[PDB]
Design a protein around this ligand. Structure first.
Ligand SMILES: N[C@@H](Cc1cc(I)c(Oc2ccc(O)c(I)c2)c(I)c1)C(=O)O
Ligand SMILES: N[C@@H](Cc1cc(I)c(Oc2ccc(O)c(I)c2)c(I)c1)C(=O)O
Lengths: 115, 118, 114, 116
């Protein structure tokens, strides 16, 4: 239900080996960690979470972009890239978090398949 | 396919369906020759746009009718058209995906030239 | 004004007016302490957000209430908020401009470090 | 000035200086006539690019030499050029700012229209 696609805007390839964590907002305004992962070479993570693990609610996906640029040899601006959103996965609703990275800029977009 | 597209609608949060596009190749005299046209499907893609044989190295211009897209959406767009012009280097089984993120008053054109990082 | 913002609305093609934001500084224990808040004017900027005195070297978080902005505009947006987290090195009159481009289902955060 | 530009370099986190550009106006026959050329300064802008008298309503094309910008940076660019094509409606003292966000394999073209 939750997929990601991270692209490197400098190299024109997906951003591989990007560490991420998915958190779910709790009733008291806190966060609970529901999964972690690292993108494969296609800048994707497969079987990140399952349907039952992704009920309606506010989610935060944190991407370790600083480590990504460091490893690539660039010094980046952001300490992390955070994507915080409301998810309504009722039906067939699948979410793709598209992330476009440059050392001093990123774009976070979502593609939400209907039901 | 050596040339793929992926168009996203940044307003609706879905791929941009029914976007008309055309692919032209720069000729020796500096003019443009149209080699393919098409319209994106519901996934914001166009399958079998051109073949490897139709894609020798050279300068290509892919023009997207984003103005009609927004107009059909009931929106007011800025750009007359979205243009992506690039020198293609297909040697070594390099394929291109032209990613395009659309908003009425903004678009982002990115290119992916491998399916994997390195 | 070591810390400036410039927010644009990619749907309307104008700056994003009345966008609420808050600036937090990371503390020794890893937590966040809020040092300023503001709301963008019609040019999508906030003047005199913080002073050089308030902006020492360290890690900062600028959080923009984009959800409220889109809700007010009449759209249902994706993001609950827009978060910009960065290590600042303002020592030496280093200015930071956080440029933010907004659409209901996408935003771009860029930095111009002068 | 009815037509401004603001070019940023997303790799360095600075405006993009010394970017060459050309402004053309579409003619009645579908062709193009050049009305201005310029090069951005260190703030990624070009001052006094054209006058209001030179900017009537119509379709304009602004071509940015981003390929040379990246080549000079020692990088490898994707795009052969960056072109921004739009129907301009300056009536009622509307000015345009073409914002351009550059990375080697990606750029964002946005427009800001203000009543100034
Ligand atoms: N196999 C599918 C996977 C796929 C999914 C999506 I959403 C894509 O678009 C992106 C992704 C990240 C970005 O930052 C931007 I801008 C656009 C691409 I490119 C590929 C396909 O090829 O469409
Ligand atoms: N802030 C001053 C000048 C100014 C105008 C604009 I539009 C700006 O935004 C940009 C520029 C390029 C980009 O690629 C992106 I995304 C945003 C900035 I930063 C500054 C003013 O307008 O008075």
């Amino acid at each position: 239900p939750l997929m990601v696609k991270i692209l490197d805007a400098v190299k024109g390839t997906p951003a591989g080996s990007v560490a991420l964590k998915v958190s779910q907002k709790t009733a008291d305004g806190g966060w609970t960690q529901i999964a972690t992962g690292v993108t494969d070479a296609t800048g994707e993570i497969h079987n990140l979470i399952t349907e039952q693990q992704f009920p309606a609610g506010v989610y935060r996906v944190e991407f370790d972009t600083k480590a990504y640029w460091t490893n690539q040899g660039s010094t980046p601006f952001h300490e992390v890239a955070e994507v915080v959103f409301d998810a309504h996965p009722e039906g067939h609703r699948h979410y793709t978090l598209a992330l476009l990275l440059s050392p001093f800029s990123y774009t976070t977009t979502a593609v939400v398949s209907s039901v």
